[PDB]
């Protein structure tokens, strides 16, 4: 599968990220069992990336683009849209489905 987007709290419902814009997010990343492996919130610094530059996993590129500014949403991302068969040594196991809690704070 690809990425599933499930709403947590609504955004403005009008402003969606376009290619080339910088997305400013807080996020928490968990394995399928629920284990947290990464979180911008624990660092108390929002994470920024530019849509369309493949700075993030494909599930983020296609999933965050479906969110409106101010929305919090749950992205469930299959391995093909994530770290794949390889995963990430000691962080993300092979063939892992990941769950991201993502809040799109603003676009720059």
Swiss-Prot record:
N6-succinyllysine: residues carrying this PTM: 53
UniProt modified residues of type N6-acetyllysine: 53
Residue span, PPIase FKBP-type domain: 20-108
Activity control summary: Inhibited by both FK506 and rapamycin.
Keyword line: Acetylation, Cytoplasm, Isomerase, Membrane, Rotamase, Sarcoplasmic reticulum
Cellular compartment(s): Cytoplasm, Cytosol; Sarcoplasmic reticulum membrane
Single GO biological process annotation from the record: protein refolding
Membrane topology: Peripheral membrane protein
GO molecular function: activin receptor binding; calcium channel regulator activity; FK506 binding; I-SMAD binding; macrolide binding; peptidyl-prolyl cis-trans isomerase activity; signaling receptor inhibitor activity; transforming growth factor beta receptor binding
First-listed, main subcellular location of the protein, grouped into a coarse class: cytoplasm
Top EC class, one word: isomerase
Reactions performed catalytically: [protein]-peptidylproline (omega=180) = [protein]-peptidylproline (omega=0)
EC number: 5.2.1.8
A GO CC term attached to the entry: membrane
Function recorded in the entry: Keeps in an inactive conformation TGFBR1, the TGF-beta type I serine/threonine kinase receptor, preventing TGF-beta receptor activation in absence of ligand. Recruits SMAD7 to ACVR1B which prevents the association of SMAD2 and SMAD3 with the activin receptor complex, thereby blocking the activin signal. May modulate the RYR1 calcium channel activity. PPIases accelerate the folding of proteins. It catalyzes the cis-trans isomerization of proline imidic peptide bonds in oligopeptides.
Family, similarity comment: Belongs to the FKBP-type PPIase family. FKBP1 subfamily.
Assembly: Interacts with TGFBR1; prevents TGFBR1 phosphorylation by TGFBR2 and stabilizes it in the inactive conformation. Interacts with ACVR1B and SMAD7. Identified in a complex composed of RYR1, PDE4D, PKA, FKBP1A and protein phosphatase 1 (PP1). Interacts directly with RYR2 and RYR3. Interacts with GLMN; rapamycin and FK506 abolish the interaction with GLMN in a dose dependent manner. Interacts directly with RYR1.
Name of the protein in its database record: Peptidyl-prolyl cis-trans isomerase FKBP1A
Organism this protein belongs to: Homo sapiens (Human)
Biological classification of the source: Eukaryota, Metazoa, Chordata, Craniata, Vertebrata
């Amino acid at each position: 599968m690809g990425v599933q987007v499930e709403t947590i709290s609504p955004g403005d419902g009008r402003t969606f990220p376009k290619r080339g814009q910088t997305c400013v997010v807080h996020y928490t990343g968990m394995l399928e069992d629920g284990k947290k492996f990464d979180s911008s919130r624990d660092r108390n610094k929002p994470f920024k990336f530019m849509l369309g530059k493949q700075e993030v996993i494909r599930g983020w590129e296609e999933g965050v683009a479906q969110m409106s500014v101010g929305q919090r949403a749950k992205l469930t991302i299959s391995p093909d849209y994530a770290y794949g068969a390889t995963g990430h040594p000691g962080i993300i196991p092979p063939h892992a489905t990941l769950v991201f809690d993502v809040e799109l704070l603003k676009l720059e």
